[PDB]
Amino acid sequence: PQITLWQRPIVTIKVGGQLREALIDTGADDTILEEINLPGRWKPKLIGGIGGFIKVRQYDQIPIEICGHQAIGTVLVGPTPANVIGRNMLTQIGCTLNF
Amino acid sequence: PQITLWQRPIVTIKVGGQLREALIDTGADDTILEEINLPGRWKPKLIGGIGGFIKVRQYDQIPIEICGHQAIGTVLVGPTPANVIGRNMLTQIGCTLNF
Ligand SMILES: CC(C)CN(C[C@@H](O)[C@H](Cc1ccc(F)cc1)NC(=O)O[C@H]1[C@H]2CO[C@H]3OC[C@@H]1[C@H]3C2)S(=O)(=O)c1ccc2nc(NC3CC3)sc2c1
């Protein structure tokens, strides 16, 4: 779709067999989801944003469906205040900015 | 322009008579700039992001040029680790997401 920015650009995702809503976030390099149960091995990572840093679990090669488009990549899980789809996944679904 | 997301979507802005680079940030409701000298009255505001919250100076009705497009609106100034152009300004320049 085309999405305008009068409201938060929230879309439906499926990840780890679970449905969630997430922000299309061009200011996010990586994809970060609130506590969600994902399978398998992970590595602890500290990431930084406005306000400071959080500890996340890094999961690699995680399949995700983003508004009906398929991607696979790194998903970081931790105490983010918002589920954010970052550029690592947005590049796979052909998402662009236009003005 | 159209901007793809293989790299950070950074553009040149002019604000307060000064030139800066800033991220086109669809996950940002508001526009937040690192310490920059802006004229006139401001109101202290606490904003939240990943990692916690920052104190910012809120300036209203600030003109900004964003990659050659003119906007006017609220600009928050404070210890953000990145200059971010949020939806309050991106809607004025006709910025959309497309996939
Ligand atoms: C700040 C920006 C530069 C980065 N963030 C992406 C922004 O879009 C976030 C998303 C957000 C929304 C709401 C919220 F409560 C918290 C976060 N917006 C944001 O904080 O908005 C703030 C601010 C703007 O106005 C209002 O709107 C929402 C809220 C409020 C005040 S990030 O989430 O920290 C992030 C994400 C991925 C990532 N991957 C990395 N990978 C390593 C480096 C290579 S680093 C990294 C850092």
Numbering used by the authors:
A (entry chain A), B (entry chain A): 1 to 99
Paper text:
The inhibitors of HIV-1 protease (PR), an essential enzyme that cleaves gag and gag-pol polyproteins into mature functional proteins, are the key element of effective cART1,2. Blocking the activity of PR leaves virions in an immature state, which are unable to infect cells, thus leading to restoration of the immune system. In the present studies, we designed and synthesized seven novel PIs that incorporate the unique 6-5-5 ring-fused crown-like tetrahydropyranofuran (Crn-THF) as a P2-ligand as in GRL-142, GRL-121, GRL-001, and GRL-003.
